[PDB]
Design a protein around this ligand. Sequence first.
Ligand SMILES: Nc1ncnc2c1ncn2[C@@H]1O[C@H](COP(=O)(O)OP(=O)(O)O)[C@@H](O)[C@H]1O
Lengths: 937, 64, 339
Amino acid sequence: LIPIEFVLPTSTPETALLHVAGHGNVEQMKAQVWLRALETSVSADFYHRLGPDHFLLLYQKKGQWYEIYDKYQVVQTLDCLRYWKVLHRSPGQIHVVQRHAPSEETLAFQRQLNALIGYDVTDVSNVHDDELEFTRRRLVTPRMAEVAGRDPKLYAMHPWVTSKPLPEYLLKKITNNCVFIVIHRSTTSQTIKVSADDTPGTILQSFFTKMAKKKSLMDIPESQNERDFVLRVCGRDEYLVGETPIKNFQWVRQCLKNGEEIHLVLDTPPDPALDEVRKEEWPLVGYHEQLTIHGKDHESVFTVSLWDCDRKFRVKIRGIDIPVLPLTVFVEANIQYGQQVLCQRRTSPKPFTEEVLWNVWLEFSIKIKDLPKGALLNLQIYCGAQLLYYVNLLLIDHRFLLRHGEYVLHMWQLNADKLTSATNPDKENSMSISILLDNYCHPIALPKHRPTPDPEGDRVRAEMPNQLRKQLEAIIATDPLNPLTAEDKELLWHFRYESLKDPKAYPKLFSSVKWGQQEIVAKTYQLLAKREVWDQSALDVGLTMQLLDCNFSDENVRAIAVQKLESLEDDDVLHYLLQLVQAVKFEPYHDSALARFLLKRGLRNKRIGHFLFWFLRSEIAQSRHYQQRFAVILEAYLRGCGTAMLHDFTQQVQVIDMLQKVTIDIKSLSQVISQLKQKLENLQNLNLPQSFRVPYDPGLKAGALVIEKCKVMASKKKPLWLEFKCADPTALSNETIGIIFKHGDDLRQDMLILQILRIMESIWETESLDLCLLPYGCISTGDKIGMIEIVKDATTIAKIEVLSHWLKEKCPIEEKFQAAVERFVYSCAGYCVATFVLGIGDRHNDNIMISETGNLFHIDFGVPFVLTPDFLFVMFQKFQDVCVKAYLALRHHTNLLIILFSMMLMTGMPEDIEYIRDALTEEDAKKYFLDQIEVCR
Amino acid sequence: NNTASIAQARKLVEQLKMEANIDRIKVSKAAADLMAYCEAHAKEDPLLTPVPASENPFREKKFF
Amino acid sequence: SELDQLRQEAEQLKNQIRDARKACADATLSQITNNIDPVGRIQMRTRRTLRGHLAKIYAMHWGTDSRLLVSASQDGKLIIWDSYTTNKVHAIPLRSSWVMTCAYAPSGNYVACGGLDNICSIYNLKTREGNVRVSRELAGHTGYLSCCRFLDDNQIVTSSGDTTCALWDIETGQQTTTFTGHTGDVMSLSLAPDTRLFVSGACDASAKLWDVREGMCRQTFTGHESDINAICFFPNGNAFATGSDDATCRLFDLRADQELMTYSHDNIICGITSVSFSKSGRLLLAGYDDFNCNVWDALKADRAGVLAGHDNRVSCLGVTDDGMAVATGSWDSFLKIWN
Ligand SMILES: Nc1ncnc2c1ncn2[C@@H]1O[C@H](COP(=O)(O)OP(=O)(O)O)[C@@H](O)[C@H]1O
């Protein structure tokens, strides 16, 4: 036992020295203190009125108020005792303080957040465990730390720096290693020329020094020093500060590539506080030897390790119950691990009544000592065979314990869905299942593996025979969509250190390991404790994606994959964010390292925060199967960012909703135009705000709606052709931020596909080519509702040999004209090569659009491709050269293209993966690709 | 790590001492011996000299 | 000091061995054998084909009766064939599918096999119940079982991926002797007609003669530029030939403690998988990784013939104790008898 001094609330605050069993339980200790208090209290009446629940035990760890949340933790394991013993604190001190009910500020704040999210974070009406609330309590510490370390100025300004080196076709654009910058101050303009390799701070110091004396003429107060200004793109809020080559900014490079001028305007430093963070008051929330009965006296037994139970797993079903009548039926349970079927057990066909009773015990050949952390009891009700329902349940809960008792679960009705770990919210007309897991006098814990040197690999270091090495390497050389036959699995598992030093095999190595056994898993952990070559490997992002894929559910494999992702720079994180999201679906738990990775990236960038916010909101609104997990993460996120981000999200969500309502109402059926304009004037009367950073652009603000420029089209859904007006007076032009708002067509496809293409080009630009594609931003907002951007000066190609006459006319000079001719070719070949890989090249012209300026873009993503004669007439050598250099460049990252195309085809859309390869197909591939080009001709 | 390197180099040198302490024989006599062995068993080697089909169990007969 | 003096003593004794060998190198086998009549062209015909295995065949071994033979295969089965009748005397399914070697006992009562499993499973064909029952699991090796040959019904030698070989007594389940010394994975071995000596080939491009009696390396031969894949004794027992991944074979005499002959041709680029001597030894049958199995005149070093009867790598081959026929198993899942 140990002495602890407990501080009572009764007046100075009474404190008494007590003792607690060294091997007791949190609750008992509470009763122990309760009674002594009730006996020694100067006014025991106060303690009599209340109970032990009302008070909490808080201990200051170096000034940090920690709370002992969990009520079943081992008293000895309490970190407080260890800290005291290292501090030699005797007797230890812990305080007892009532549970003060909330204030209003907090409830209003929570209501605001729930309005933002579209789902309540405190909803507990469809839950069988306390997993969600514990996830919420846990996530606080990483967020508080991530927020603690960061710069106010840089975050607020959020420089969009980059670290890649320039491609060829852009280095030439910089003549004499210099670039021309337009500088605005009031309406005073000053053009200067500065070297492309000088950081913006030096540029501003130079701009001060050049014209210091005539600063008044430039209309700057003379009292201001250099500290008072920073550059800011005119018409945006994208500041340009920090220590980065002025050539390393994506806007500079876009201005160069497209060829516009560089316009910048001086600005003042936005203050730090405006991003203030809502304070938070939620306080700061073994080994097989200790958890096994053997070697211990029955008197002092408190827990049983899961590995000591050799009984075959057994589960008792009771029956099914459907309140509504929709034959033979039969349940069919199966244990599964990441789509891998461990064991099965069906039951006899039975009459199909609204309630059918079985009360039968099924037993699984797998042994309770051979359950991996994260198996998944899958429960199905077939029909006769057509599957009708399903449900899943974790067999180990979130705190390393086995499931025991009677469980009643609601049934989803028929992917990343069939691997769902949540209960149906529809508790009124949903099939229900009742099952029993046998109790146990003590908890069935599951210890942590301990790392032990593995001589099977250490001293096995002489090169293997060249034939076996040849077989190993030849096996590793196939694509990840190549299923490993048992033979290969055994070969690889025996050779489990010839591959440890070859990262390009790690998602074939861990596709052989057989988790159904305990020795296999122990040796796998030993293997992964020695990972030098992987750690300092090449940071590929097609490999660390197959590590975060569906087939894997381990706690360390994903750990190392995320430890590789820890190095990526901002732009890349943002490139593959969408897929990281579609990937968190496959997780086994709610509280993981992927989620904390996303969270920790979100809190030091604003563009990441914006895109993460919109993707998570879209999925919550669209995907109820995981909506609780997404919502928990999203709320744990929204409490970290600044107040300004909160306000911006609020206004954005206001506008999206208002338009939602207007739109649907319209879709109900000059009459329509007139009613729309009445409703839009009402929206102005409903205070549709004019300051909302467009969802797919963190820097582009829209303004008061130009009512006359709106309209309703004649297409199927008939979206609204809104035309907002900029909301910053320093806009270099008077163009309208154009949007289109369509409802009724799946807008998850166009988002993913656009990320795909955007990477396709990031690969092409990595290879110093330029196919000049136009990725117009799209973001989906709900079920069959999604905002689309507008490509100024666009027209439909079906609407328009005459094409080259249209073009010629549009172009007043043969020079611009031929610039457009290069654009049309480069971009007509790019798009071709890039739609043909994905297998969606077959489309009617209705979905193709040509921009007057020469670009060619596609739309409406719902023959190899479309290479209509007109395309040929407008064009031929360069077209072919570019086509080849493209296709060849793409085939150098087939692993990654196929990974993406798959990690998406499952989570999104309703053998399908084979096409990508039939068409992926060196010289032979070129000949095929050109047979595809010349046959469409 | 000298006691291991030394125990190994000692095993090595005791092995090389084993191998070097043999009275080798002139290659000419090694050949003469092998040649006269084949010369002796050339008759008793049916792979070298084809035997009658009747004496070959595979060709002549199906019953064994 | 102690290690540099011991290293220079090592590297002096090495050139003393090279000089002790060069001294006997008075004439080559090609000089003395220039006169003997060439063997001519060994026109061989495929007599039998052994179908039934579903995947790669990794090993085979004739019985001493020159009629029965075991065969190990990738499909996890160990089949006993009657070469004369082609019938499967036994079709034993194995515990591990990655079997790599098999060895019919000279007595014919026991058969052994093993592989990646790191265990040498000994099976008894003449079981109490007449079934195919596992007599022993000779475990203790820390690497894949690469090869093994029966000394008797109660003793058996096995090589492994720990860079060592070992003699076992089947009854005790204990490593009688352990043959350490190699610096590479031991791919093959070969018992001398006198069960007191055996040679072994390894991937460090060297072979070593071991004394079964004691367990010491008597001589070490080099010359190959790559791993030694196969090794076997000359019928007399005073010489042995080695096949290597360097696309060349070599002959070594124990008494001369050096190479006598090289067997190679510029056309041959793939490594050698297997070798065997004729009953007299005049013919050397080398298996290759080009679906071929070339017949060399061991004394002339001339390519007497070529056996091209397999569609995949000719992985393994053997010769009957009476020299009556040549078996060749291959990755095509078919063995083929030759005469
Ligand atoms: N970014 C954009 N800029 C200009 N117009 C666009 C844009 N995106 C879509 N459109 C217009 O929307 C129309 C296609 O809408 P959609 O409902 O997808 O047609 P469908 O129902 O036939 O597939 C086209 O006529 C096209 O001009």
